Design a protein around this motif. Structure first.
Motif, short mmCIF file in Angstrom:
data_model
loop_
_atom_site.label_atom_id
_atom_site.label_comp_id
_atom_site.label_asym_id
_atom_site.label_seq_id
_atom_site.Cartn_x
_atom_site.Cartn_y
_atom_site.Cartn_z
N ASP B 291 -5.74 -3.81 4.65
CA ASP B 291 -5.46 -5.21 4.31
C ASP B 291 -6.74 -5.87 3.76
O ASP B 291 -7.84 -5.65 4.29
N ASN B 292 -6.58 -6.66 2.72
CA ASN B 292 -7.67 -7.44 2.18
C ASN B 292 -8.32 -8.38 3.18
O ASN B 292 -9.53 -8.56 3.16
N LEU B 298 -10.74 -0.09 1.17
CA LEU B 298 -10.22 0.69 0.05
C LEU B 298 -11.27 1.02 -0.99
O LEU B 298 -11.43 2.18 -1.34
N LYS B 317 -6.13 2.91 -5.74
CA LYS B 317 -5.84 2.31 -4.43
C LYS B 317 -4.87 3.19 -3.66
O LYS B 317 -5.04 3.39 -2.46
N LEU B 321 -5.48 5.15 -0.25
CA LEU B 321 -4.63 4.79 0.90
C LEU B 321 -4.09 6.01 1.64
O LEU B 321 -4.15 6.10 2.87
#
Ligand code: HEM
Ligand code: HEM
Ligand SMILES: Cc1cc(N)nc(C[C@@H]2CNC[C@@H]2OCCN[C@H]2C[C@@H]2c2cccc(F)c2)c1
Ligand SMILES: Cc1cc(N)nc(C[C@@H]2CNC[C@@H]2OCCN[C@H]2C[C@@H]2c2cccc(F)c2)c1
Ligand SMILES: C[C@H](O)[C@H](O)[C@H]1CNc2nc(N)[nH]c(=O)c2N1
Ligand SMILES: C[C@H](O)[C@H](O)[C@H]1CNc2nc(N)[nH]c(=O)c2N1
Ligand SMILES: [Zn+2]
Lengths: 411, 407
Positions: B291-292, B298, B317, B321
């Motif tokens: 999560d940002n 990432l 990404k 992930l």
């Protein structure tokens, strides 16, 4: 009344007032939410209010609400309804209507583009051969040698419901499916039943893995007729991978033009039962759904085999690994061939900007989270974190039952 | 009034009748669906108690029996005179198990009947709460062979004597906002960390500092306790193929233990009811790591893999992930700490849904939460229609106490 939506990543809060204009029901109640259910002839009586609501919206949008032209048009439509029991849309109203059905389509992530839609008015069409010609022209215009342009072609509206125009294909371009005696499927399992109909109607099936199906077209409630789209009009992309040279030998390809042909367009209470429309693909539609659903091409195993992934345990995430590589290949392939495509990161970021814009200028943006979040990498896209309100605005696109279940065969 | 749910992969159709026993509101109307929104007296208590005791006596095949009517009477009398009542142990256990069974957002409910219930209704102080919680933590952890458990502190009375665990989970990492302007540790806990500091905690000011418990007994001001470090089983994160992965210095804890929810059973409200199971790997690898607004790793990982980060369409990404999630699973499995992958958990949930349909007439489920945050459509839950509705006994979200509490 006001409703708020929050974005849990940015803490941005938006205020919806547009839901106040929503008419139709959702399927949900105070006691049950049907957010994940796929599917949760009019009288003069029900028609004039619907026409009036629509014309009020149209005239507001052109900044002429309550004008003489507005009032005259209301009167004219009123008189047409009382006398003929339906009415005809002006071209400018049909255009506005089709753009708005797109704008209002809560399941559509591509709506930033809504105002750029080429509308082809095919309401003068009378025969299936005429439908065929209109659809070819649509495909050629939309395809534009790979520089895809959104378009919709609109055939005559419903009258008594006995004379409907319908495209029996669910999309204009799709691959045949053939159920084998051993129970395996050759080609696309999603289209097996439709393929059998085509065959029954006299289609000579090549019986390969990517046979473009023929159009089956019904005009004026008549029995449908078969036509083959000129192969030179069907742009296709062979699928290869930027790093993996064995990927090409899987023999995969897909068509460039996603063109939905089974939906019903409602504008001002009129029902356009044949209104094929097209845009361009988001990569995941092909790479995730068409290729990797167990009920579609189902290529996960074969890809993962060739990648030499450990397949003896789901916890190695082999399926997830193979899935990303297949999606890389789709995007690479389309881009290399200069065929328009959008990846799910770009499409979702654009959607969030569209949705914030719509909240500011329109007071809301109905959106169906279940559909807008992409089917891979959900939470690394900004839509996963965005609260959405789903409600139904008209003009609208609606699902309709497949015509083979309801058609009265004439013979 | 009778509703169907279809699986679009398998064509299997199930009929839901259980929803007609639902009572609480969804937030949806006929005009608007709020499915994606995170948060959408003596007189009031007796029907709630009756509803519950009826389902309980039904479950033990004693509905309408002398023992049933007698309990209904005893509870009525106790409410009439005391303005509340006390659950029998058997009822408490049944109610907790059923609050889990009814949890529409929980993918792991195949497990619902194996829940160890620790009755802590005799607890009177924050030190007593700490003791119960350490015992819960040690029992549930079981040297990595995790066991589902809940510990249930005393029920609400006049609501100014609430038991609360201020922590959102029993085990979490501190977050500290920096002069650099960024965040050190877990950004989700910056507020709680400051409250811990302002109540006296000496923060080590690191990236992975296990927070202290802040415990409130009997509506008093909450007190700080460090969980014995030896009871907190943590896992260093490495990768089976990438040797550089260990050098990011990532770790996570083995025990997911939700401690900010409210358990409602037969109208009684248990405001402190920490519970715990075991992780589905995506919670850590997708949400906690990527999560940002969380650890947001990432970019660092993508860089170490030397992927093309110039364009989103390279899916850099998405590749990173998957690798992060392979590492979480590999690490937990190597260190023999229970974890479940999203393929296995969702397969089990479909099986559970089918059991619940045939045996109970349905299974409330929130598709938005049930479908994993990565690879949605390659898991079977993606293709499964779900009906979401509220049954009691239930777990409910409650507001953070620092807003409510007066010192
Ligand atoms: C221009 C690029 C477009 C993109 C990238 C896009 C993307 C998508 C995607 C990914 C979906 C879900 C499809 C599925 O999962 O089957 C969808 C749904 C839909 N879109 Fe779009 N779209 C575009 C253009 C259009 C156009 C031109 C129209 C109509 C004029 C339209 C109307 C719809 C409707 C009505 C749905 C719901 C379909 C259903 O219920 O089966 N979209 N869109
Ligand atoms: C046994 C292993 C378990 C697994 C694998 C599991 C799985 C999960 C997952 C992945 C979520 C979503 C969490 C999130 O996204 O924040 C969740 C939510 C939830 N689960 Fe479970 N669960 C387990 C045990 C339990 C137990 C023992 C209980 C209660 C006794 C429970 C009750 C809940 C509740 C109430 C939620 C919603 C929490 C919220 O709203 O924040 N689960 N479950
Ligand atoms: C039961 C049911 C209901 C419903 N509303 N739609 C469907 C069709 C179901 C929904 N996801 C699978 C199947 O669609 C495949 C076609 N996808 C084309 C829409 C996407 C697309 C993409 C980009 C531009 C476009 F114009 C169109 C099925
Ligand atoms: C505003 C809000 C509402 C709500 N109902 N939950 C939250 C908590 C939000 C929702 N997803 C992230 C954050 O939870 C992280 C906690 N994860 C532990 C629950 C999962 C878990 C997993 C396995 C076993 C368990 F017992 C528990 C926030
Ligand atoms: C049951 C569930 O509603 C169904 O599988 C949905 C989920 N989300 C989707 N989202 C998109 N874009 N397209 C789909 O076909 C679906 N299918
Ligand atoms: C806005 C949206 O409801 C929100 O981001 C949800 C989506 N689904 C989720 N699913 C799970 N399991 N956990 C979550 O925290 C969330 N967050
Ligand atoms: Zn709803």
């Amino acid at each position: 009344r006001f409703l708020k939506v929050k974005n849990w990543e940015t803490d941005v809060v938006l205020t919806d007032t547009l839901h106040l204009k929503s008419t139709l029901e959702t399927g949900c109640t105070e006691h049950i939410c049907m957010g994940s259910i796929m599917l949760p002839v009019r009288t003069k009586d029900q028609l004039f209010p619907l026409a009036k609501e629509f014309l009020d919206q149209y005239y507001s949008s052109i900044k002429r609400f309550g004008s003489k032209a507005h009032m005259d048009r209301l009167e004219e439509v009123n008189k047409e309804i009382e006398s003929t029991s339906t009415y005809q849309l002006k071209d400018t109203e049909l255009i506005y209507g089709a753009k708005h059905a797109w704008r209002n389509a809560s399941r559509c992530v591509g709506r930033i583009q809504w105002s750029k839609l080429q509308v082809f008015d095919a309401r003068d069409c009378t025969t299936a051969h005429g439908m065929f010609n209109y659809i070819c022209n649509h495909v050629k215009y939309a395809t534009n040698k790979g520089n895809l342009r959104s378009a919709i072609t609109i055939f005559p509206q419903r009258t008594d419901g006995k004379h409907d125009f319908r495209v029996w294909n669910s999309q204009l371009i799709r691959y045949a499916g053939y159920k084998q005696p051993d129970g395996s499927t050759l080609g696309d399992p999603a289209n097996v039943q439709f393929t059998e109909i085509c065959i029954q109607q006299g289609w000579k099936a090549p019986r390969g893995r990517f046979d473009v199906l023929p159009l089956l077209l019904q005009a004026n409630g008549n029995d449908p007729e078969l036509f083959q789209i000129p192969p030179e009009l069907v742009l296709e992309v062979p699928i290869r991978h930027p790093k993996f040279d064995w990927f090409k030998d899987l023999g995969l390809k897909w068509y460039g033009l996603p063109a939905v042909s089974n939906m019903l367009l409602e504008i001002g209470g009129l029902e356009f039962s044949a209104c094929p429309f097209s845009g361009w693909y988001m990569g995941t539609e092909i790479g995730v759904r068409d290729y990797c659903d167990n009920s579609r091409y189902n290529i996960l195993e074969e890809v993962a085999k060739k990648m030499d992934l450990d397949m003896r345990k789901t916890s190695s995430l082999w399926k997830d690994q193979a899935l990303v590589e297949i999606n890389i290949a789709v995007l690479y392939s389309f881009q290399s061939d200069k065929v328009t495509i959008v990846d799910h990161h770009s499409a979702t970021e654009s959607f969030i900007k569209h949705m914030e814009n719509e909240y500011r200028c329109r007071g809301g943006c109905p959106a169906d989270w279940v559909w807008i979040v992409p089917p891979m990498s959900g939470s690394i896209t900004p839509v996963f974190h965005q609260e959405m309100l789903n409600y139904r605005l008209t003009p609208s696109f609606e699902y309709q039952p497949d015509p083979w279940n309801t058609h009265v065969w004439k013979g």
